[PDB]
Amino acid sequence: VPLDGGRFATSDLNDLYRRVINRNNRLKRLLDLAAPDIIVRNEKRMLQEAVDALLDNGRRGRAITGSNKRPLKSLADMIKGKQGRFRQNLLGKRVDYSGRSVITVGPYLRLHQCGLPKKMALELFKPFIYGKLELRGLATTIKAAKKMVEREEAVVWDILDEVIREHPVLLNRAPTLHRLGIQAFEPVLIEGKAIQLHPLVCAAYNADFDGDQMAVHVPLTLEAQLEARALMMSTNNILSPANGEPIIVPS
Amino acid sequence: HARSTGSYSLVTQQPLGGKAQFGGQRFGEMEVWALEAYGAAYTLQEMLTVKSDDVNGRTKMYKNIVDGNHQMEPGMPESFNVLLKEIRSLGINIELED
């Protein structure tokens, strides 16, 4: 880890590995020098704690007292973050072709629709914009298409509308309890930063407009577009999963 | 905030945090259950492999959208390969059979 940007301070694992190397080289030297039984036993006792702290800092007093690193961070702690390694491996973490913005009403839009931002739709569908311009022949190559999108010409928004014509965007709330929270909709253009979510859809998701964010997700590939349009669509998911009654109703 | 592709972390080939280098906006474990409940396997596969974890998968997927072919070549996520290396370092002998 760099403190300034070249200094390169030793990380949590490197401190633990250094303690084992320092203990191993120190003990190995004492065996050649032929030290008494008190020192060699005490040196091995330090190596027992050093190797144990490197593998798993638990059920024993060890590591620094919050100077830079707060607890210890052993190999076991690297695996078991919170609930194992579920955040990185199981969940996925971060994920490309995604964003987030403030919620909004917009009743003018249809039931199976969502008023997505203009700047966000350009950024989210960036490779689709390059492919459209390269196909249409406006840009000579992907380098020219990259310069055109960065410069933000008038022709870019014309191609972006055709790119986001029949392609659903997976919207989702922060507390995804049920399957109804994560839902897809037809992304419509809108001059504004805040994303427009439907009134009937707000009942299922349970997201009141009072500084409530809603993360977007561009569905890449052919299979996910068919899956989001058929299974995860707003128009398809009318009735509730738990109860037989209608989810999307007048509130 | 919005982002298509950019920066990636050193430990586990994944995108950045959010609102600094690259706009991540994490998926989470709960959203995987929502995708699994609805039954969107291909949508769930690309989220935790193609457009997130796999370095070789992301490079191959980027060329497919530009050319206008779509589809996906996922392979191994790499984050799972780190779990094999981390498990290997702590005395356990884990390896992919066959």
């Binding site: 299979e223 | 699994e36 039954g39 396997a41």
Partner: peptide, 19 residues
């Protein structure tokens, strides 16, 4: 093995018998 993947998993499982 659920929804879309269930069809692929069922077909892949049948191939494991012979090879």
């Amino acid at each position: 093995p659920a929804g879309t993947g269930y069809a692929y998993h069922q077909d892949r499982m049948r191939r494991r018998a012979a090879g």
